[PDB]
Design a protein around this ligand. Structure first.
Ligand SMILES: [Ca+2]
Length: 223
């Protein structure tokens, strides 16, 4: 997250870190056994880390649970990033509490102008490179489809939306991939892609989660 703030320990209780020897992506806990992330975060050997603040220090509220299976969306295209969503099942159910909690799926799509919370352990620099140990947060509005498409000609599908600031300065970045965009207590987005970070007229692009609620529910119900 570039131009954000330190969230505070365990203040975003649905935020997970995906770890394969090191943090490589964010995710969102949606029930005791399932995490939603980006399809471009797919790899084998995933351990889900819940209750994290400082990802380099064991602080006492963590749960480390190996993934038993991952399910990339059937229509995910890695070239265009259309349908950039994946589900990860935990080998055992997380113990849910005030600091490890699921986030509700949307029942309807959120509108341009809706204020959301974006979070992650990604790069905090737009030019250089600096990775935080503690979770960073950004409050950002959803941008209109027209402004999103104008920012990225030929690249925005019906499964994507822009959030952030056309002036730049505040954005998601490398390492935030797969993490949450939460608006009014609902998971509306997944950190998907952008052109650099916090650049003028290049806001972050997010997977439009409301399009996938039926797929998420039916997949969970049979796996
Ligand atoms: Ca920790």
């Amino acid at each position: 997250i570039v131009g954000g703030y330190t969230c505070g320990a365990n203040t975003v209780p649905y935020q997970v870190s995906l770890n394969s020897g090191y943090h490589f992506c964010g995710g969102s806990l949606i029930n005791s056994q399932w995490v939603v992330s980006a399809a471009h975060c797919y790899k084998s050997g995933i351990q889900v880390r819940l209750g994290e603040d400082n990802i380099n220090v064991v602080e006492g509220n963590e749960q480390f649970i190996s993934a038993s299976k991952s399910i990339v969306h059937p229509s995910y295209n890695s070239n265009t990033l259309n349908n950039d969503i994946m589900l990860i099942k935990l080998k055992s159910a997380a113990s849910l509490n005030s600091r490890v909690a699921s986030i509700s799926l949307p029942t309807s799509c959120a509108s341009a102008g809706t204020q959301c919370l974006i979070s992650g352990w990604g790069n905090t620099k737009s030019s250089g490179t600096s990775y935080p140990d503690v979770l960073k947060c950004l409050k950002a509005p959803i941008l209109s489809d027209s402004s999103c498409k104008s920012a990225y000609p030929g690249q925005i599908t019906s499964n994507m939306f822009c959030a952030g600031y056309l002036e730049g300065g505040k954005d998601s970045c490398q390492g935030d991939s797969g993490g949450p965009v939460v608006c009014s207590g609902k998971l509306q987005g997944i950190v998907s892609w952008g052109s650099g970070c916090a650049q003028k007229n290049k806001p972050g692009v997010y997977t439009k989660v409301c399009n996938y609620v039926s797929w998420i529910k039916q997949t969970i119900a049979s796996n």
